């Protein structure tokens, strides 16, 4: 099916507390496999997935050098951003970065992403054409002009279409046992009263992969959002996700409420009735 | 693989 790979980086400045804490992680569509924490003593890109350990010492020696450059490339980058926004050198700020590639069913390139961020706000983003940019503010238009003096687009464009995709199938085909397969959820319902004739009905669905799932509480063929609480998807830590949907009903009307689960791993959308 | 990085 459709899968993707993402790379997330985070640099958090700290005045007087040493070099800024740099955290960089590598993400496949919904499974993390590599990480790099600056304050760790190893100072090398450490794996976090079993199937990625096949790559030889050249891979780690390459990925270590490329990201340690990014740490210093972003460390000195903040000292420029403080000048751009005329901030205090004793202030604390955060730098964020993300860019990856999505593919189709048979390995076809689908889309390309590249977006930076400064203190939770966008700074510069590569357009969908991958051959132009979009600066957010006037301070970003300075860097946007640079990165236009150099031909940064066709390097990142050739990367998002190339070594991002060309290296992606190597990751998937190494680990087709764990990534390409989908685990359907384990579904059940609970029952919890609060008064003599009013209770809380919560629909449970546990252990599914990936996280895209739809839950809807319907009453006699009519859906309901009023008096419904739906928490965001939460991870289990092993490679599965969880989500519950809540609805408060008065007593005597429970059998009419229906919980429905729609998920990719299920060939048929589930219909649950208490 | 982790791509390159350019300063501002």
């Amino acid at each position: 099916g459709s899968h993707s790979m993402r790379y997330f980086s985070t640099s958090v400045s700290r005045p007087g507390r040493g070099e800024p804490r740099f955290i960089a992680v590598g993400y496949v569509d919904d499974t993390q496999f590599v990480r790099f924490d600056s304050d760790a003593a190893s100072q090398r890109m450490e794996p976090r997935a079993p199937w990625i350990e096949q790559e030889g010492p050249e891979y780690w020696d390459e990925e270590t050098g490329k990201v340690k450059a990014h740490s210093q490339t972003d460390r000195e980058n903040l000292r420029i951003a403080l000048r751009y926004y005329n901030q205090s050198e004793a202030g604390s700020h955060t730098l964020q970065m993300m860019f990856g590639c999505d593919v189709g069913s048979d390995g076809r390139f689908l889309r390309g992403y590249h977006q930076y961020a400064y203190d939770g706000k966008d700074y510069i983003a590569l357009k969908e054409d991958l051959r132009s940019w979009t600066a957010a503010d006037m301070a970003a238009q300075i860097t946007k002009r640079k990165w236009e003096a150099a031909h940064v687009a066709e390097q990142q464009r050739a990367y998002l279409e190339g070594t991002c995709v060309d290296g992606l199938r190597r990751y998937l085909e190494n680990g087709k046992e764990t990534l390409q397969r989908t685990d359907p959820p384990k579904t059940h319902m609970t029952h919890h009263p609060i008064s003599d004739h009013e209770a809380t009905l919560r629909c449970w669905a546990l252990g599914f992969y990936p996280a895209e799932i739809t839950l809807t509480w319907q009453r006699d063929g009519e859906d309901q959002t009023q008096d419904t609480e739906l928490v965001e998807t939460r991870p289990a830590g092993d490679g599965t996700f969880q989500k519950w949907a809540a609805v408060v009903v008065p007593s005597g009307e429970e059998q009419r409420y229906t919980c429905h689960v729609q998920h990719e791993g299920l060939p048929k959308p589930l219909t649950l009735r208490w | 693989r982790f791509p390159l990085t350019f300063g501002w």
Partner: T-cell receptor, first 114, second 113 residues
Framework: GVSQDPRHKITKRGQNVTFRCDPISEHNRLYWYRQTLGQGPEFLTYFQNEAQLEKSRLLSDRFSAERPKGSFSTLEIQRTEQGDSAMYLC?????????????FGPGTRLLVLE | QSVTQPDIHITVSEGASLELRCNYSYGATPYLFWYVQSPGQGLQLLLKYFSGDTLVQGIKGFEAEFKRSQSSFNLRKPSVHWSDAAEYFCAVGFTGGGNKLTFGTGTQLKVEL
């Protein structure tokens, strides 16, 4: 436009060596290479204006390279042996020019003797 | 992840055409360089290409053309001078494998008068 020092050096086997490289101004990257007699250069390491980022694992730990102040580099190889006698190159780049052109220096040829 | 330089030794007469081939692995779109090394001194950069112009005109009358369909970046010169007798290296930098350069096997060229 790179300047290296020295060009030719000769030592007895089993000792340490030290050379310097003064690359171009406003260039923040420094790649070290080792070229045998009449062959393609062999990669050693590269820096980004402060410190060492990558080193060839096929090179032993007695190879020491450092660029402390980010303007000039230093190279130190311990326990000299004739198998390491070759020309050692120093190059610089910008990391802001997308072609990332590397400009090399006049190099330094090493000859070790017993 | 390889660089192939087929022409390993060439000796032509002065004033003739010249072409040196350099083929890389049919993978990504990497950086490309052609360096010359005189017997004594270091390497002198001739030309480079990543912008997107398949034809590149360089120094010393040397011009190079990029052909992605063949994955070749071949050095050319219309009429070789008598001074061009040196070792010619084509160097690439594999974009995903770091900014380090990957050098070729080396071509030793001499010119007869």
């Amino acid at each position: 436009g790179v300047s290296q020092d020295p060009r030719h050096k000769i030592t007895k086997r089993g000792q340490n060596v030290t050379f310097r490289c003064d690359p171009i101004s406003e260039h923040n990257r420094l790649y070290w290479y080792r070229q045998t007699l009449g062959q393609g250069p062999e990669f050693l390491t590269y820096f980004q204006n402060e410190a060492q980022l990558e080193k060839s694992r096929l090179l032993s730990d007695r190879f020491s390279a450092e660029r402390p102040k980010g303007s000039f580099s230093t190279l130190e190889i311990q326990r000299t042996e004739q198998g390491d006698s070759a020309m050692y190159l120093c190059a610089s780049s910008d990391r802001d020019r997308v072609p990332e052109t590397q400009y090399f220096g006049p190099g330094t040829r090493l000859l070790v003797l017993e | 992840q390889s660089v192939t330089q087929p022409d390993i030794h060439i000796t032509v007469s002065e004033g003739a055409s010249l072409e040196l081939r350099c083929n890389y692995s049919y993978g990504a779109t990497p950086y490309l360089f052609w360096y010359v090394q005189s017997p004594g001194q270091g390497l002198q950069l001739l030309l480079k290409y990543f912008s997107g112009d398949t034809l590149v005109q360089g120094i010393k009358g040397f011009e190079a053309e990029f052909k992605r369909s063949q994955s070749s970046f071949n050095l050319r010169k219309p009429s070789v001078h008598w001074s061009d007798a040196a070792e010619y290296f084509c160097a690439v930098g594999f974009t995903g494998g770091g900014n380090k350069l990957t050098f070729g096997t080396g071509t030793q060229l001499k010119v007869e008068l």
